[PDB]
From a paper:
Influenza B virus hemagglutinin (HA) is a pH-sensitive metastable class I viral fusion protein that undergoes dramatic conformational changes between pre- and postfusion states. When it egresses from the cell, influenza HA0 is cleaved into the head domain (HA1) and the membrane anchored fusion domain (HA2) to become a fusion competent HA1/2 heterotrimer. HA2 consists of the N-terminal refolding region 1 (RR1) that contains the fusion peptide (FP) and a heptad repeat (HR) motif (residues HA2 1 to 75, using the influenza B numbering), the central helix (CH, residues HA2 76 to 105), and the C-terminal refolding region 2 (RR2, residues HA2 106 to 184). In contrast to influenza A, an additional challenge for influenza B virus HA is that the correct native conformation relies on HA1/HA2 processing, which allows for native folding of the stem without splaying at the membrane-proximal base.
Another variant, “ARWF” (also named “Stable_HA1HA2”), incorporated three additional substitutions (S40A, S110R, and H114F) and revealed both enhanced expression and a Tm50 reaching 74.8 °C. A pattern emerged suggesting that HA variants with an S110R substitution tend to exhibit greater thermal stability. To better understand how these substitutions contribute to the stabilization of the prefusion HA and to assess their effect on its conformation, the structure of the natively cleaved Stable_HA1HA2 was determined using single particle cryo-EM to a resolution of 2.7 Å. The overall structure of the stabilized B/Iowa/06/2017 HA trimer has a root-mean-square deviation of 0.7 Å compared with the influenza B prefusion structure of B/Brisbane/60/2008. The structure reveals that the K209T substitution mitigates potential repulsion in the head and that His220 faces upwards with Nε2, while Nδ1 is buried by Thr211. Specifically, substitution Q64Y introduces hydrophobic interactions with Lys278 and Ile315 in the head, while G68Y establishes weak polar contacts that help to shield the Glu79–backbone interprotomeric interaction from solvent. Moreover, the E113W substitution at the 3-fold axis, combined with H22F and H114F, forms an expansive hydrophobic aromatic cluster that spans the entire cross-section of the stem, involving all residues except for Phe22 in interprotomeric interactions. The S110R substitution is strategically located above the FP's Phe2 and forms polar interactions mediated by a water molecule. Overall, these substitutions collectively improve interactions and stability of the influenza B virus HA trimer by stabilization around the pH switches in the hinge and neck regions and the elimination of three pH-sensitive switches in the head and stem reducing the structure's sensitivity to changes in pH. Additionally, the high-resolution structure reveals four additional residues at the HA1 C-terminus which have been disordered in all previous studied structures.
Numbering used by the authors:
A (entry chain F), D (entry chain B), F (entry chain D): 1 to 166
B (entry chain E), C (entry chain A), E (entry chain C): 1 to 163, 163A, 164 to 344
């Protein structure tokens, strides 16, 4: 979004993430390692589902025939009735398109707040000795292979086992 | 090492529309519309639905029941939804009519916009003692009753002069209000005409006659025709030489009506007492099955998606909403170039 | 030590509805609706409001003033808002009418949809010299004037033949346009009928008569009745033997009208010249007090909240807007479990 | 919100806050201490008030009777007129419900930005020697009792009096 | 040193309206509205636009072409958009008419709401053999044809009795349906009247005559006038002593019509067959140039801005949308006090 | 906005910024120096342009005359037709005003996220040795005159040339 364009985020992504949309990746001597976060993905899905429920629960009134107007004796009234139906359909369609446009706008914008949340969860769990750079990346003093990231993304990483202050 | 936060990259073949970025590619979507398919008409789910007016009357059309044809009398069940399955209703019965010189073809459809419809239990006027002389009530061979042999419509009385066969000036009857307080009254009247010889034999005058009606500020005027009629259609099949012209007038609650007439009057006997309101759309018969919504172009529908795209029309029930284009709700993440290997250098 | 930021926890008994979280509990709200209570009708605050047409005319109804009854003539004040307080207006006055054979009962209500209404200062035609012979103008004992003794409605002239009491063919008058350029003209005419003996004594013919009117493409046809009338209602109380039938026709600016007639005509004298437009809703009288809005189900209202819930109806003035449900605006913070003591371990 | 679920914020709150919605709490050897922030509460209230003014200042046109149509002579036209009124009321009601839904959505979402603002105001005023953890909490080298938090929440805290660099 | 992020400060003379801050001052804006200026009417860009009905017929009005005046016959081009440039159309031609006693002035405007309009190629009835006797067809000196000398309207036949000049009772013709299946049929008929001497010379009776028409439930009744006519207007300028009254009736597809008549009938010959639909607004002629939109108050417009403020009216084409107030979109930053020097101390 | 009121941002701005809306300013012994950022300004302008395109691309149906109703013969139907046109214009005008109000709300709110993005881009590019205060300002160990800020705002600043760790 407009936030990552200026803050210095990465413009590309990883296909090692198969079990989620948002996740972690560690780059080091061994190369690259990738893991996926499940809770962030789950609540993004939940919010999209609640939005779908909101969109699906609005009612409008039925349009049916006038009871007293007969064919070929009241043609002028029946033409005006048809025009009324046309105009009402047009107005409600325009309103629904506006609501869907707002929904998609919000869904596409949340992608940088879901990533700031991840960045500072990682900062809290990575220990006081790490250094924040500014674009979501962190520099550590220890090796982190696939099992390391597996424990990090699962919310069980403890730097105490790494002989470093916590 | 360097630990970073990131976002996945996948195939992004779907396109959605936003308000500040334009159109974007997304991994996945949720559709919100369908285009339905034409089907047959059904019974509305949760409501009693009207097709024919009297479905226990056999070999009757709706105009037969509305006019009171013998052996087409029965009780008319109530309903909150009706189907208009016939834009120009036909008869199949009694004396031949010149249907196209009045608005009578639309009387059944009018009756189907009310929830409660019934035929009164007493006659609204006494026909033999009406102005214009003592009368005798005529019956037709093309109108047999339950024990066959001669009848007529139950909403009218064919009044032929009893003793004095003479011409007359216009006469006036006041048609009273006999329904209860919240109900509308529909009165059916008309007139009969024949060729010259038979007109002089039945009534005593062989000139055109003039008829007028007035109710609730609405006025109507007619003149009859002597000889040279069109062909008989939609009747019992017996040869005749004359025809009838039939009309109806509506009296809103409390109000009285007026008819002015000359020789040949069919005076009103039973009136329709009608109250409530019903919901009508156009459809077709028979009603097969059950459905959530009834749609004028698609028949019976079951609601799956909240919206639909197609032809907009009238609909009754639990229905989706019409939109111009197919709409989608994003259920993925924006397109992300596969730049693993770019940073993996 | 550890210093943290936080959010309060309180009782959260209110519920509001969001778009991505569902329904949530909140500490406090701001209501946005009320359900009003039925009250009486009032004067609109800032505008002149019409009740009766002429409120300085005493012992007159609105139809009395519209028909021009003697001692019910007066100046009609202008107004931009009107109250329709009578769905079937009545007379209490002059010669007896058969009100239900035309549309005349609705003439006052029509007149109340215009802002400016006045009665012309000259007669539209000269009655004594109209086609059909020299006439003399008839007066009635059930219609006394300011110095009592005999009168008639000021909008019509009862034309009885002066010298020659004979039958006639239909006659035609052209009714001209006498108002100024932006105004509509309403013309009131009618006819009188009696029993046979009195018809032969007054006019010279004892048969039904035929009347026709035409204006701006709208045509109307009537036939009169000889004897056997219904009972007198809403009149001065004197016994009579005949009745009148009254009607009106509208001439849009510039246009001329036409009447075709026979024996018994009540020719038009004063016409209503009417221009502008007024806003009408149904209500009741008297108007007591002052209010911001007038509502057809609730009477006078003062605006406190922007919206309301109840029965939707027509309304005029400074009014709230109708909504289906009671709406609330959150004025608190979301529900927060009292987890002090949980972290206080 | 979805931000505090991932960033690691606290899921509960304090009832020692009686003079505001948002505030501070200090946990230490003496136990717990609580204070409330007045300016944040005040501007949240102000924004809700401006939103109420926006909702309350929209007008629609009056619906009244047609001037030329008379009862029992123009019944078909009067039935169509009643239908027009029904449809217009339905449409405007749906639009108002949409606007209120958007308003409540915004009001409920601002609760995490009002708290990030508080977090970094606290970081600025707490002095260079404090350490940010990542979930809004801070670790200090000095005791902070009720009067300490009273001066902190009032915007008069100066670490110079605590013999620490500022 | 101290490096900080900041925002510019400039002149902020514009004001915009937000939802949680009230009205704010902004550096710059983007307008979204204009108030247009009155112009002339043009041709719609991309569609064929109708002005006059037959523009290759010279010295003809629209009512001349609709009535079939000699030398005003021609082919009527199709069009999907029409301009209504005359609220009360006039003639300039044939026999004099009393235009104001029927609805005939509006026949051209009706015809301009259909996309395809044509005149049939055969007569709908045979006039010389119609009921009422053998007829001969009358021509007028105020109606010359291509080789000058005598003519009449092509939509009607003036039927004068050939041998027997006698009075008659009402006669009835049934007017059949001669167009193809999707088309509407418009039938034009009328009657002629004169002073007493000439009525006894032409027809054999010198009393008012009665005419009636009926189609698709719509009924109409007329009575003629003998002598004392108004002045001739909008005709060929020859002196006459009688006048005609002209009317039309519409037959929806499949349906038959009926006319009842007496002495003086102008029987229908050519009918208008009409199908499709066209879009109409009020304007003026001539059409000069080309434009994106046609507006009833402003003429031709070209779309620059999405919205407009002014008088709302009907419009056809590619048009902006009406809004109450001038709207602006912020294209700057909020007002920022010039507090450089305040911090620069 | 409500974010800068609490976070401690500056309430005023600089008129040395002529080539942009958002930018940098350095305050030191030499006085003040000002420079403007071009990319942030450009994408703010781009988003406002896309919003204008969204507002300008909505259609409603034309209103024209009824084909069958004639003047002075169908006056009641023509009065109802005029009322229908009035009501439809009122409804669509109200909807358009709502959409413009939402647009201006969003445009005015983005002014603090455009500034957080700038703040942490600056933190990333200013080197590990700088210290964040909390209100967008930074403290450096080196002099920064106009050419220094010119290289900073242009995205070419490298602290290596300043004999400091990067
Ligand atoms: C973003 O979404 C759009 C919309 O679906 C994607 O555009 C689509 O791309 C495919 C792959 O090129 C197109 O397939 C076509 O195949 C035929 C041969 O069968 C070839 O001749 C065409 O040139 C084209 O390659 C498809 O037509 C196209 N859809 C549209 C509407 O243009 C797009 O690939 C997605 N991703 C990106 C990164 O844009
Ligand atoms: C006017 O309509 C009446 C309708 O009845 C016509 O009268 C009918 O005319 C036919 C003509 O032949 C009569 O048929 C005859 O029937 C008798 C008895 O069956 C038979 O003996 C004869 O050889 C012949 O078949 C029929 O009876 C008669 N019906 C009556 C008088 O009731 C009449 O012709 C019509 N007039 C005109 C001018 O068309
Ligand atoms: C819309 O939904 C309704 C409701 O389910 C559908 O009607 C259902 O149609 C099925 C299939 O014809 C029927 O239910 C089953 O019928 C078989 C027939 O042998 C029976 O043996 C089963 O025990 C079961 O009853 C039934 O007509 C009806 N189901 C119910 C529960 O009423 C309808 O077909 C759907 N589609 C449309 C277009 O209406
Ligand atoms: C969130 O808001 C809802 C909606 O007001 C609250 O639900 C309400 O809770 C009270 C307390 O239990 C219910 O009172 C009832 O009292 C009767 C005895 O008089 C008892 O039989 C019921 O079982 C119930 O306790 C009240 O009915 C209920 N309202 C609704 C609509 O269910 C709720 O307490 C609020 N807080 C939370 C944390 O949910
Ligand atoms: C038609 O209506 C006229 C209305 O006047 C009826 O005429 C009235 O008939 C009564 C019947 O008795 C007359 O009453 C008489 O009055 C005179 C004078 O007061 C008195 O001497 C008699 O003893 C009797 O009371 C009344 O005068 C008379 N009015 C007239 C002629 O102007 C007439 O009866 C009605 N005709 C029918 C057939 O109903
Ligand atoms: C809606 O608001 C109007 C405007 O305030 C209300 O009319 C007010 O009613 C009060 C009470 O009847 C009156 O004002 C006071 O009346 C007493 C009567 O003794 C007088 O002594 C005071 O000096 C004062 O005038 C008056 O009718 C009117 N007030 C004004 C300033 O015009 C109305 O009652 C409210 N409610 C409704 C349903 O309209
Ligand atoms: C924010 O926007 C408003 C709206 O444009 C600005 O208000 C305007 O300020 C100017 C300068 O004072 C006013 O000019 C007037 O000049 C006449 C002399 O010609 C003087 O008598 C007036 O007292 C006034 O100074 C202008 O009328 C005024 N517009 C309105 C509608 O009040 C405002 O300056 C902008 N900036 C700020 C910081 O408010
Ligand atoms: C009814 O209308 C007819 C229309 O023709 C009137 O007849 C016309 O009356 C004038 C009166 O003078 C006749 O003028 C005469 O013309 C002859 C021949 O040119 C000439 O010799 C005489 O000296 C005089 O100028 C005119 O011919 C005559 N037209 C006819 C009979 O066809 C008639 O007068 C009108 N009746 C009434 C009562 O108004
Ligand atoms: C709305 O836009 C249309 C379309 O451009 C305008 O019509 C244009 O008017 C110009 C000026 O009259 C004409 O184009 C030029 O005309 C001169 C005349 O000498 C010719 O020499 C040039 O070669 C060129 O054709 C033409 O009428 C028309 N332009 C086109 C390309 O069709 C219209 O004036 C605008 N305004 C309104 C209110 O409609
Ligand atoms: C069915 O129609 C026959 C027609 O004949 C009716 O039989 C006559 O009914 C009248 C009416 O009361 C009697 O006056 C006659 O004596 C009956 N018999 C004749 C004419 O032979 C019969 O009543 C009708 N049945 C109904 C209406 O239920
Ligand atoms: C009130 O009505 C009486 C009815 O008698 C009128 O008195 C007659 O009016 C006519 C009309 O000018 C005169 O010809 C008579 O000479 C009057 N006197 C009689 C008949 O005795 C009186 O003019 C009316 N007053 C009005 C209309 O102001
Ligand atoms: C134009 O009008 C003249 C009027 O005289 C027509 O000429 C007469 O037409 C009739 C109709 O066939 C013939 O019976 C006469 O013999 C013609 N000549 C006379 C009366 O002198 C002429 O036919 C018309 N031309 C048309 C209709 O094209
Ligand atoms: C009426 O019936 C006769 C007999 O077959 C037929 O010749 C005639 O065409 C019919 N009339 C019509 C209008 O069809
Ligand atoms: C109105 O009627 C009453 C009731 O009879 C009467 O006492 C009063 O004098 C009348 N007033 C006028 C002005 O006619
Ligand atoms: C008319 O008045 C008489 C006299 O009391 C009464 O018997 C009759 O019922 C009345 N008519 C009506 C229709 O009420
Ligand atoms: C049209 O009228 C003018 C005016 O008299 C005349 O000069 C011209 O010849 C006429 N043209 C046609 C085709 O009739
Ligand atoms: C008819 O023409 C005559 C002759 O000039 C004139 O005196 C009279 O006023 C005209 N009629 C009308 C209604 O203008």
């Amino acid at each position: 979004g407009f936030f990552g364009a200026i803050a210095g985020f990465l413009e590309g992504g990883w296909e090692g993430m198969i079990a989620g949309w948002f996740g972690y990746t560690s780059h080091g001597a061994h190369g690259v390692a990738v893991a996926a976060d499940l809770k962030a993905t789950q609540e993004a899905i939940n919010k999209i589902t609640k939005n779908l429920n909101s969109l699906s629960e609005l009612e409008v009134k039925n349009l049916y025939r006038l009871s007293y107007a007969m064919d070929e004796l009241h043609n002028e009234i029946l033409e005006l009735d048809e025009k009324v139906d046309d105009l009402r359909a047009d107005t409600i369609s325009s309103q629904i398109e506006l609501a869907v446009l707002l929904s998609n706008e919000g869904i596409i914008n949340r992608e940088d707040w879901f990533l700031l949340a991840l960045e500072r969860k990682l900062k809290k769990m990575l220990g006081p000795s790490a250094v924040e750079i500014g674009n979501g990346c962190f520099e550590t003093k220890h090796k982190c292979n696939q099992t390391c990231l597996d424990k990090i993304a699962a919310g069980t990483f403890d730097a105490g086992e790494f002989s470093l202050p916590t | 090492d360097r630990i970073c936060t990131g976002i996945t990259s996948s195939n992004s073949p779907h396109v959605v529309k936003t308000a500040t970025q334009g159109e974007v590619n997304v991994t996945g979507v949720i559709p919100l519309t369908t285009t339905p398919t034409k089907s047959h008409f059904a019974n509305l789910k949760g409501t009693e639905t009207r097709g024919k007016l009297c479905p226990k009357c056999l070999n009757c059309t709706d105009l037969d029941v509305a006019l009171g044809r013998p052996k087409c009398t029965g009780k008319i069940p109530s309903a909150r939804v009706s189907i208009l399955h016939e834009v120009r209703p036909v008869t199949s019965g009694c004396f031949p009519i010149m249907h196209d010189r009045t608005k009578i073809r639309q009387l059944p459809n009018l009756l189907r916009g009310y929830e409660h419809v019934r035929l009164s239990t007493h006659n609204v006027i006494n026909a033999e003692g009406a102005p214009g002389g003592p009368y005798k009530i005529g019956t037709s061979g093309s109108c047999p009753n339950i024990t066959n042999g001669n009848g007529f419509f139950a909403t009218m009385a064919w009044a032929v002069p009893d003793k004095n066969k003479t011409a007359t000036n216009p006469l006036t009857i006041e048609v009273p209000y006999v329904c209860t307080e919240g109900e509308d009254q529909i009165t059916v009247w008309g007139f009969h005409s024949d060729n010259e010889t038979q007109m002089a034999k039945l009534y005593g005058d062989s000139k055109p006659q003039t008829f007028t009606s007035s109710a609730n500020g609405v006025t109507t005027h007619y003149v009859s025709q002597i000889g040279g009629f069109p062909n008989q259609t939609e009747d019992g099949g017996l040869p005749q030489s004359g025809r009838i012209v039939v009309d109806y007038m509506v009296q809103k609650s409390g109000k009285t009506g007026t008819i002015t007439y000359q020789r040949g009057i069919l005076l009103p006997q039973k009136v329709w007492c009608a109250s409530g309101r019903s919901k009508v759309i156009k459809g077709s018969l028979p009603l097969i099955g059950e459905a959530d919504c009834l749609h004028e172009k698609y028949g019976g529908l079951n609601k799956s998606k909240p919206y639909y795209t197609g032809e907009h029309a009238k609909a009754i029930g639990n229905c989706p909403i019409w939109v111009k284009t197919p709409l989608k709700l994003a259920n993925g993440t924006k397109y992300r170039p596969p730049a693993k290997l770019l940073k993996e250098r």
